[PDB]
Design a protein around this nucleic acid. Structure first.
Lengths: 51, 171, 159, 192, 185, 63
RNA sequence: AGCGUGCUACUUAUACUUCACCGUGAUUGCUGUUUUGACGCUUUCACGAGUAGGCAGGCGUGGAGGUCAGUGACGAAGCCUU
RNA sequence: UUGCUUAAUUGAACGUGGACAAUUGAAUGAAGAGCUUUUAGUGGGCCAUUUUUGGUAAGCAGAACUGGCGAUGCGGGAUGA
RNA sequence: GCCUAGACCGAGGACUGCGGUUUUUACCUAGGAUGUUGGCAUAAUGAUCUUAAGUCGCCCGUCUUGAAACACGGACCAAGGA
């Protein structure tokens, strides 16, 4: 009788998407990425500056 | 417009006859990458036998200003269409960013020649390193030693409708 | 004085091709048409017997009758809000086999040939044609192909 | 979710590596487009009118998902002066389906309020959840036709913030029609 | 506003009830509305539709048609169902023994069926001995044998009958019907 | 005094597309109208003979 | 507060989105609880401009058959009236 | 199978029997498809973009395609089919 | 992910469903508004009529491509009238 938005209603969100809980529990939306500090532009791609 | 400088690189679509086509680069001043890729094809089809359907966009990259807080003088070469014919001009601008000087150029030619954005081709934008490279007096006058000037007749923007005191323009 | 005769407006449609006048090559008279074949109609100006009307010039139809020197072709013509089947008698000089059959008939045999093999190899194969999809990712190497910088050229008069 | 993340990371890594080896990584052309009819129903020539009816864009601010091939690209080219289309991101698809997702069940517009509704109509295509449907749409899958036709055409509202000054001109010339290619997401956020 | 791909608010164009106000015909609809809704047999939904048909769409079924249907292979013992009147045929040389369920029987048709040991039941009795319409055979009368259909679609080179009041040598036989009087169409 | 419109096809395609433009129906057996009589005459005997042959064929396995 | 051009915000259509109510069309279900309404009740979805014209359902007037053992000289019918 | 056709056992047309199933052989869509009867009003049109003929031109005359007005209110063009 | 400000609405009417927390054959924010408090019932509230103000609104019928027309009929009222 009444549509409920899952983006506002948490219970409807869990009803439709059971994985949402895990996404919140693991902080998937703010998960860091592990990588080294590398700059692969020092070579030829520096022709972006001038060509 | 509010613009950015883009690198767009493209090529003809590879053929079994021609399997490594030449890569072409252009510097495009556009508000966004959708126009930047559109302007790229506009200038290739004026210089080479290529189309968007028979070609390919390789890369689009923003070119940031090298020294955004250094005051420069830019010489710009133009090709614009009037109501009657097509003309070339060379105009000079003082600005800190290469993009903004182009933004000044578009405002300038709209004001002085009624030239719309569609009517203008930028042939070249060049930094003027030396002072003797400056040809136009409307920018040469700001390169003088120890330049000072007041701002007479300051107008203060009032928040209220009615001021109880007489206005003043000192500054 | 409006004129709407049988061959009105066929000044160019019924002309022979440039440097193709004169006699008809006999491959025209050697082709065999069977009832149910798909044929194209193109009036030949040099043969005034059994000539189609100008409407049927360039139309494709189904042979339904074969006589001594002619074939009966079926054409659907829009007359108002519906189609009407027209039955045109054409001498075979004005008629050519439609090439659209052969490409499809080849695909019928090609599809069967591919399908039976997939059963033999214990696999499955998809036979539907696919529209040209967008191209996938690729890597462009630049040995000998450093990008050339192009700029718009200045205006110049060339007379 | 894992494969979305890994696809993004692999694309970024490929771009970085091509940058390292003096090459140029050309991204795979988009396979999915979102099309929004931004023009009313008055004074439309017969051919674009028929094309818009075949894309199920029968009202203003109505959106639909289209899988890009030559045939559909040529279809969309005929409707270009009346529609705005672009390449939608995953979050855009998810927000669209969650807030405004309706299925066509017996020619009726039924809200996707439970996974049972989706299953009862797309189980023979192995779509058992709203996430299955979103994945089928995003990574255009074998059963894209059935899933996209099951979705009722989305009924967006007018943008919050408005369009540009004048709509009915191409996005390149300061309008809104045509292809905007990633700005469909900002427009949909305005419109959903 | 909506771009309407089709016409709006269009009725189905099929009868959903009998135009008749016969109270007994409505009891059959009541009985077969329940069976069609509650049984999920294809026979029940066919009978319910036939009860709505107008008189010209329920032509009389002669006792000869039923004879010919009973002569089908394996159909000698099927229950003949006729949604309409079963009439007599004096051209028959013999009639078999069979059960026929019909809306109406003429005096002659009912007589012959009973005289040969058959049974003439109504459609309500059918729902007792065949609630699913098991082992039945629906027979329909000829619709295009009606006289009004002779004149439908009259035109040149059509071969239909003209709408005429009198028949004779002086009534639409000269010009347009005879090549000796101009043309023939 | 009576100079009026001579001819126009304006609105004519609209009226054609309200209920049309309907393609003709196809059938398994098209009519043999206009087919050559010599073939048509012989096609009668060929079909008549085929029906006889099948009727005998169904006879051996029936009774 | 003109002309060329750019940007930001803001204004508002019977248009779009969500909701209510009306009607139309389709649609779900309803007899071992069908029970004194199945020409009924009920679920869901979509739709709603309109001359000429077509069709449907209704309102009203004079008279007729039936019925209300109807109203009425303790005031019928008519007429006037925030 | 034939009385047509072939020098012919060749064909032509129609078949008997057997194999090839859901990628049964492009896309997209389908308030479903097909069929019939019967009858109304109408048969003065006009305008806009684009193509176009006569004319110096015309809010002129005559055509092509589409969309409109007529038959239509509503927001904007001060006002206006 | 979190906090936070405001506006409009409350259809439905025993239960049934999908989920969640399970501490549980329990409870929940999960198939549509309830709780509490004050006032009033000589009134708070609602409707209509008359009028003011703001805004919009050309005189109907007709033939017509096109009528408010400087096109035609119409002073008004009753009864009759296709």
């Amino acid at each position: 009788v009444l549509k409920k938005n899952p983006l506002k209603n948490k219970q409807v969100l869990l009803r439709l998407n059971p994985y949402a809980k895990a996404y919140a529990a693991e902080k998937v939306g703010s998960a860091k990425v592990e990588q080294a500090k590398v700059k692969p532009s020092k070579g030829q791609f520096a022709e972006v500056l001038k060509n | 417009s509010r613009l950015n400088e883009y690198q767009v690189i493209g090529r003809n679509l590879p053929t079994e006859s021609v399997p490594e086509p030449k890569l072409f680069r252009m510097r495009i001043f556009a508000p966004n990458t959708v126009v930047a890729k559109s302007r790229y094809w506009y200038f290739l089809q004026k210089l080479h036998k290529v189309k968007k359907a028979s070609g390919e966009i390789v890369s689009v990259n923003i070119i940031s200003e090298a020294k955004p807080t250094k005051v420069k003088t830019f010489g710009i070469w133009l090709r614009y269409e009037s109501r009657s014919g097509i003309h070339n001009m060379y105009k000079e601008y003082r600005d800190v960013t290469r993009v903004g000087a182009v933004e000044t150029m578009y405002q300038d030619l709209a004001a002085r020649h009624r030239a719309r954005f569609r009517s203008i081709h930028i042939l070249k934008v060049v930094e003027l390193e030396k002072t003797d490279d400056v040809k136009r007096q409307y920018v040469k006058q700001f390169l003088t030693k120890d330049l000072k000037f007041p701002l007479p007749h300051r107008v203060q923007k009032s928040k209220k409708l009615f001021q109880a005191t007489a206005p003043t323009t000192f500054y | 004085g409006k004129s709407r005769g049988y061959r009105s407006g066929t000044r160019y449609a019924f002309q022979r091709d440039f440097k193709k006048h004169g006699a008809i090559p006999l491959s025209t008279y050697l082709k065999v048409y069977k009832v149910g074949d798909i044929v194209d109609i193109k009036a030949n100006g040099s043969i005034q017997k059994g000539m189609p009307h100008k409407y049927y010039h360039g139309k494709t139809g189904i042979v339904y009758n074969v006589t001594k020197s002619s074939v009966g072709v079926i054409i659907n013509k829009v007359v108002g809000n519906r189609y009407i089947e027209k039955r045109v008698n054409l001498r075979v000089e004005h008629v050519k086999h439609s090439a659209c059959r052969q490409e499809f008939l080849n695909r019928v045999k090609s599809n069967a040939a591919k399908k039976r093999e997939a059963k033999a190899n214990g696999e499955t194969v998809y036979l539907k044609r696919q529209a040209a999809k967008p191209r996938g990712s690729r890597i462009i190497s630049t040995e000998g192909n450093i990008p050339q910088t192009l700029a718009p050229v200045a205006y110049e008069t060339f007379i | 979710q894992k494969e979305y993340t890994e696809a993004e990371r692999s694309v970024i890594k490929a771009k970085r590596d091509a940058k390292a080896s003096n090459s140029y990584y050309v991204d795979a052309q988009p396979k999915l487009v979102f099309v929004v009819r931004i023009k009313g129903i008055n004074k439309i020539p017969p051919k674009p009118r028929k094309v818009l009816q075949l894309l199920r864009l029968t009202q203003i601010n109505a959106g639909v998902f289209v899988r890009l091939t030559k045939a559909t690209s040529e279809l969309i080219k005929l409707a270009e002066p009346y529609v705005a289309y672009g390449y939608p991101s995953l979050s855009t698809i998810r927000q669209l389906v969650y807030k405004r997702g309706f299925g066509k069940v017996n020619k009726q517009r039924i809200a996707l309020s439970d996974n049972a509704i989706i299953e009862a109509n797309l189980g023979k295509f192995n779509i058992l959840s709203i996430e299955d449907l979103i994945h089928e749409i995003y990574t255009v899958g074998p059963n894209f036709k059935q899933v996209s036709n099951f979705l009722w055409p989305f009924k967006l509202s007018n943008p919050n913030g408005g369009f540009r000054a004048r709509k009915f001109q191409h996005f390149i010339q300061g309008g809104d029609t045509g292809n905007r290619e990633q700005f469909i997401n900002a427009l949909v956020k305005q419109m959903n | 506003g909506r771009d309407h791909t089709s016409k709006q608010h269009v009725r189905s164009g099929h009868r959903t009830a009998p135009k008749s106000d016969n109270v007994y015909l409505q009891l059959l609809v009541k009985l077969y509305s329940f069976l069609a809704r509650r049984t999920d047999a294809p026979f029940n939904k066919v009978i319910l539709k036939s009860l709505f048909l107008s008189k010209i769409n329920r032509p009389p079924v002669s006792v000869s048609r039923i004879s010919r249907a009973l002569k089908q292979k394996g159909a000698a013992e099927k229950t003949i169902v006729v949604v309409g009147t079963v009439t007599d045929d004096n051209r028959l040389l013999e009639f078999p023994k069979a059960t026929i369920a019909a809306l109406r029987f003429t005096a002659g048709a009912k007589d012959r069926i009973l005289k040969n040991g058959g049974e003439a039941i109504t459609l309500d009795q059918l729902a007792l001995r065949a609630p699913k319409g098991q082992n039945t055979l629906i027979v329909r009368g000829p619709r295009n044998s009606r006289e009004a259909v002779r004149h439908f679609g009259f035109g040149p080179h059509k071969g239909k009958a003209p709408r005429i009041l009198s028949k004779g040598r002086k009534f639409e036989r000269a010009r347009g019907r005879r090549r000796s009087r101009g043309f023939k169409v | 005094m009576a100079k009026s419109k001579n001819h126009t096809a304006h609105n004519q395609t609209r009226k054609a597309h309200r209920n049309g433009i309907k393609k003709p129906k196809t059938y398994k057996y098209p009519s043999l109208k206009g087919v050559d009589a010599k073939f048509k005459r012989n096609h009668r005997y060929a079909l008549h003979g085929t029906a006889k042959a099948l009727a005998k064929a169904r006879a051996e396995k029936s009774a």
